Design a protein around this nucleic acid. Structure first.
Lengths: 548, 568
RNA sequence: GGACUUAUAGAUGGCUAAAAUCUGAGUCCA
């Protein structure tokens, strides 16, 4: 319900120097920018998230024991967001540098933090009780460091005390997400951090201390930023006779975020400002009486209404479903007869074994995953994900080997009545009769189509919802009294750039036309091809209407 | 548009003892009750009796009985009445108990509808088609006077003469109807345009993203096809239900009246005890949007700024191979994209089909930007090419080229995180977990388990037949008749295209509710079984018999304050 | 504004979702 992330970043010489793996941008700068994006995303996606950011060892006068506080662990808010935004802008303008802000020096021998103080700080931070802030259900520490071997690596007894500091955190449900940074030249030896972050029982033995290249920092942050939102859990029946019943969990991989769904209602009357509520009130059309909570649902059947008892409702559903959520295997089938791109009706779920409900679940699905991959088969499922819903046929497909997450994807199959009819046309003459002219049109289309292949496929990351971005930007600017930059006296060029700024998709569309437009200007006969293809296509379009 | 249907039931001693009148009654009951739900103003029903001891009709002809007058609209209560009139007649003449009848009906139709544009039909239930004498002088007489088609039903060459003469007349069996009204039937929903605009490649952003009709059609640097959008898949939630309260009346059956609802607004004055709700006006209520830990009421002019001004269009972003697009990216219901020969010219249908054809041959999917209306949601979508077979005038097959539109996710939509490995499992730190003992026997038995339920023997729907043209399901009359389509039947063995079970179940139960409690006057409802035909479609398929008892054993399966949060 | 058809219909809603809410939608006549 309420997760909190504690950013802890270790300062060093290589953290300040621009890296070729980062398009010549500082790792420290990359972490800051990643943090700006994180809060920008979560304020839309999961605003009930607490974020705090700390640096060490910092030589600033306002640093306690060498640990500087950018902002404390608080729920995401425009005030902290502005603080970071202003810092990044002070950097961009050349008003200050990163060295100037954190009071760092290129001496080759700056002070370093005592890890004892650091791990104790993390524990104290998550134990604080802040009045206006809710209790945290999930506590995590994003640990960024560049030093493989700190000073405390030589002292064996220091490691021992550190190991109980780490355990002390694990006992308080505080988990580590490590960001141990290695470069092309300098690699990260995780030998030290392995020792102190390890546990002594089988499953949980601490976090991964495997280092990462700086090139993967931003992506790693924004990936581990998200939280598993459990959509449903139910038994998976494989064969009921032999009690071949197993447990599974389902997660929504792709939601449908809409702007303006997050709101409260305020009632203000003179000096009274108070929260208001919407109340749906049912009336009797004959008397005007409030019959709320005294209404019933019936089946209309002509000039007759039919109300069944709960006992009868039970018997009716009993013929094809259970009360609680379930998934029953109807059979298996080739993926090429089961999965299509033209009959989706719902959003997909990601299915994972639930061995907390049924032991042996992991062994079952791991084998089923291996087998269904080997034969390229899928499972046909019958059931429902919620108690209060209708059942349906589902497709259970094994995760690809290219994907990192190992499990299954669940696709709902449309009922026969969910498959709508194709509309009748006024004409059916598509010009297929004239073989040569039609075959030419396909050929020129095929060539035009070649100039616009998506070599990196489709990535959701590249397309921000413009509706969402517009909505939260207006809220953002109003809270911080940022005056709008929109001008009614817009130049077509001004308007053009605004459009591409507000919509990631329009920016792409702009490139496509431009490539066609720079294909006619160009006098290189090779580059010249694209635009001439388009002209030929239009020639066929106009020729067809002049003839048929 | 409008039609009339006249039912005639033979009451010979053969029809009674062979239980052929009770069968036809079951058809009449199903037919009329379903008609009652629509209560169409232009759908007429009327019934007569043949070879009947009762003689009551307009022309005062013996052995003819108009048991039910011309009725429109057909209501549920009226259907209850008609069936009970017949049920009483059927029970009386159980143990102890035609040519001119067809002539009386024709006269009663000419006086009822006169010359109005109405599709008239006569439906006849009888046995012994051979045992009946209708002279050529009577057939010569029957064809001239009649402007009404004939539907004959055999309950067990002479009868053929009438059917062959009268235009568009057919002959069916009794059990042919008794099986049709038993089997599930997909509802025919007439396709309705949900979008009308342009499919564009290389269009000007300044020209398209305005409310101006800036024709990209005249842009020779742009691929511009006029297209329409229809719904391809749409979710159903069963029979629509009515919110109601119960009322009393002189004849206390379960009598209900519909209710309406309003939205009221209240504040809570708390007195940890409970609060005192007080109704307040909407005028003193404002929406406060959330931004992190703060809530914001915007001035009216800024509340307009929040809405992103979007403009109707479909703009191509690029192309990729089918396998390049992860299937789980598809998040919404699907829609058809067809060429617009209505508002556009015939070049659109040609150019559009050429595009789809190329996408089919190269197995390509298009990524596009979609906006249906002004200020509507902006969507990233996948455009998948499809074929749709149409019944053609020529002996050759006809495939209509089309596209399927389905929404792709934005950045803010993905909830993906790192999940624990399932195959090569490790600890949280990442050290390789010890490989499971009895591992080879598990994968071996699981493989047999998957083969045991192999449904590949069950055929996928033929190419270009998953979707179906609206024309191939439209018929002349609204009477439940056998499909007559040879390809449509037993295409129902596709295990991934099954009837909407919970809807059928609803209709099945409501029919028996009416039959038992309203017509038979029983006071106990006997809810029928779900047909084995439909049960099988949601039951485990067995290809080869297999005992998973060993598999289960080795797997080891065992069950275990907001008033200051306002800011600025 | 009417007639007809559709209710397994046409839409909305949303802290990501209620066995919720509304009556809409298409065609033809003035």
């Amino acid at each position: 319900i309420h997760e909190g992330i504690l950013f802890c970043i270790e300062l060093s010489e290589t953290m300040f120097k621009e890296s070729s793996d980062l398009e010549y941008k500082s790792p420290l700068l990359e972490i800051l920018e990643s943090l700006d994006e994180l809060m920008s995303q979560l304020v839309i996606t999961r605003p009930g998230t607490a974020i705090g950011c700390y640096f060490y060892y910092c030589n600033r006068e306002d640093a306690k024991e060498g640990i500087y506080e950018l902002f404390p662990l608080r729920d995401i808010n425009a005030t902290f967001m502005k603080k970071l935004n202003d810092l990044l802008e002070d950097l961009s303008s050349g008003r200050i540098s990163l060295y100037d802000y954190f009071m760092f020096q290129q001496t080759g021998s700056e002070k370093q933090v005592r890890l004892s103080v650091l791990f104790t700080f993390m524990l104290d931070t998550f134990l604080e009780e802040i009045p206006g802030q809710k209790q945290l259900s999930n506590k995590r520490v994003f640990l960024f460091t560049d030093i493989d071997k700190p000073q405390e690596a030589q002292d064996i007894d220091e490691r021992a005390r550190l190991r109980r500091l780490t355990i002390d955190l694990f006992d308080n449900k505080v988990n580590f997400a490590t960001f141990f940074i290695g470069y092309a030249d300098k690699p990260f030896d995780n030998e030290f951090y392995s020792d102190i972050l390890q546990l002594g029982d089988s499953e949980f033995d601490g976090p991964s201390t495997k280092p990462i290249d700086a090139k993967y920092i931003k992506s790693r942050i924004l990936r581990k930023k998200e939280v598993k939102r459990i959509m449903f859990q139910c038994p998976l029946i494989l064969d009921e006779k032999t009690n071949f019943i197993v447990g599974v969990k389902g997660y929504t991989m792709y939601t449908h975020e809409k702007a303006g769904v997050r709101y409260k209602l305020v009632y203000e009357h003179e000096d009274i400002r108070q929260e208001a509520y919407s109340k749906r009130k049912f009336l009797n059309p004959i008397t005007g009486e409030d019959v709320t909570g005294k209404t019933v649902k019936v089946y209309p059947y002509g000039d007759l209404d039919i109300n069944l008892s709960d006992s009868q409702d039970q018997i009716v559903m009993e013929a094809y479903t259970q009360k609680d959520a379930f998934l029953k295997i109807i059979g298996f089938r080739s993926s090429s007869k089961s999965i299509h791109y033209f009959n989706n009706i719902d959003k997909s779920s990601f299915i994972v074994p639930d061995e907390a409900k049924y032991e042996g679940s992991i062994r079952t699905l791991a084998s089923l995953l291996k087998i269904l991959r080997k034969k390229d088969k899928i499972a046909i499922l019958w059931g429902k994900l919620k108690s209060n819903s209708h059942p349906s046929l589902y497709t259970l497909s094994p995760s690809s080997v290219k994907d990192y997450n190992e499990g299954f994807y669940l696709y709902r199959v449309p009922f026969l009545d969910e498959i709508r009819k194709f509309p009748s046309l006024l004409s059916y003459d598509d010009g297929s009769e004239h073989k040569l002219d039609y075959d030419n049109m396909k050929k020129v289309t095929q060539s035009i189509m070649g100039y616009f292949n998506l070599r990196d496929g489709y990535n959701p990351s590249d397309f921000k919802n413009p509706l969402l971005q517009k909505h939260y930007k207006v809220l953002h600017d109003y809270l911080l009294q940022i005056e709008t930059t929109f001008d009614e006296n817009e130049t077509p060029n001004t308007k053009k750039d605004r459009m591409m700024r507000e919509d990631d998709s329009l920016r792409k569309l702009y490139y496509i036309r431009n490539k066609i437009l720079e294909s006619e200007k160009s006098e290189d006969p090779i580059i010249q091809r694209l635009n001439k293809y388009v002209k030929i296509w239009n020639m066929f379009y106009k020729k067809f209407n002049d003839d048929n | 548009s409008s039609e009339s249907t006249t039912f005639i039931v033979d009451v010979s001693p053969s029809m009674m003892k062979n239980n052929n009148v009770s069968k036809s009654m079951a058809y009449l009951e199903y037919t009329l009750l379903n008609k009652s739900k629509k209560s169409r103003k232009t759908d007429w029903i009327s019934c007569y009796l043949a070879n009947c001891p009762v003689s009551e009709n307009s022309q005062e002809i013996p052995n003819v009985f108009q048991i039910q007058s011309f009725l429109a609209p057909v209501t549920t209560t009226a259907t209850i009445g008609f069936i009970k009139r017949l049920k009483q007649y059927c029970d009386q003449h159980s143990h102890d108990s035609m040519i001119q009848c067809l002539l009386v009906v024709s006269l009663d139709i000419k006086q009822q509808f006169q010359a109005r544009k109405i599709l008239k039909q006569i439906v006849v239930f009888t046995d012994n088609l051979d045992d009946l004498d209708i002279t050529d002088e009577e057939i010569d007489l029957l064809t001239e006077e009649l402007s009404t088609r004939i539907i004959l039903i055999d309950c067990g060459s002479n009868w053929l003469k009438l059917v062959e003469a009268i235009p568009n007349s057919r002959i069916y069996n009794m059990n042919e109807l008794l099986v049709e009204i038993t089997s599930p039937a997909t509802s025919v929903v007439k396709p309705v345009r949900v979008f009308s605009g342009e499919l564009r490649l290389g269009a000007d952003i300044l020209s398209t993203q305005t409310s101006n009709p800036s024709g990209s059609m005249q842009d020779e640097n742009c691929l511009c096809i006029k297209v329409e959008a229809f719904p391809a898949t749409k979710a159903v939630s069963g029979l629509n239900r009515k919110t109601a309260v119960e009322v009393e009346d002189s004849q206390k059956k379960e009598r209900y009246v519909g209710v309406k609802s309003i939205i009221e607004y209240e504040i809570h004055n708390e007195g940890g005890s409970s609060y005192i709700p007080v109704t307040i006006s909407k005028d003193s209520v404002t929406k406060a949007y959330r931004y992190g830990a703060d809530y914001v009421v915007l001035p009216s002019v800024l509340v307009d700024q929040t809405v992103y001004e979007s403009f109707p269009g479909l703009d191509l972003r690029g192309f990729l191979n089918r396998e390049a697009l992860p299937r789980y990216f598809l998040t919404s219901e699907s829609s058809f994209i067809t060429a617009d020969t209505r508002l556009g010219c015939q070049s659109d249908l040609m150019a559009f089909s050429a595009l789809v054809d190329v996408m089919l041959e190269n197995r390509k999917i298009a990524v596009a930007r979609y906006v249906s209306k002004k200020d509507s949601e902006v969507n990233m979508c996948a455009l998948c090419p499809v074929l749709i077979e149409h019944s053609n005038i020529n002996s050759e097959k006809k495939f209509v080229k089309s596209l399927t539109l389905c929404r792709l996710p934005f950045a803010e939509d993905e909830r993906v995180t790192d999940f624990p490995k399932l195959l090569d499992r490790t600890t949280t730190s990442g050290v390789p977990l010890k490989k499971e003992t009895d591992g080879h026997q598990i994968d071996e038995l699981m493989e047999q388990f998957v083969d045991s339920m192999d449904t590949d023997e069950l055929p996928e729907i033929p190419l270009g037949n998953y979707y179906q043209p609206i024309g191939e399901v439209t018929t002349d009359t609204t009477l439940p008749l056998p499909s007559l389509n040879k390809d449509q039947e037993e295409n129902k063995k596709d295990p991934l295209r099954i009837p909407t079970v919970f809807v059928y179940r609803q209709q099945q139960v409501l029919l028996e509710w009416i039959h038992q409690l309203m017509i038979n006057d029983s006071r106990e409802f006997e809810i029928p079984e779900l047909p084995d035909s439909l049960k099988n479609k949601i039951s485990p398929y067995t290809h080869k018999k297999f005992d998973s008892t060993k598999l289960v054993e080795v797997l080891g399966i065992k069950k275990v304050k907001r008033g200051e949060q306002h800011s600025r």
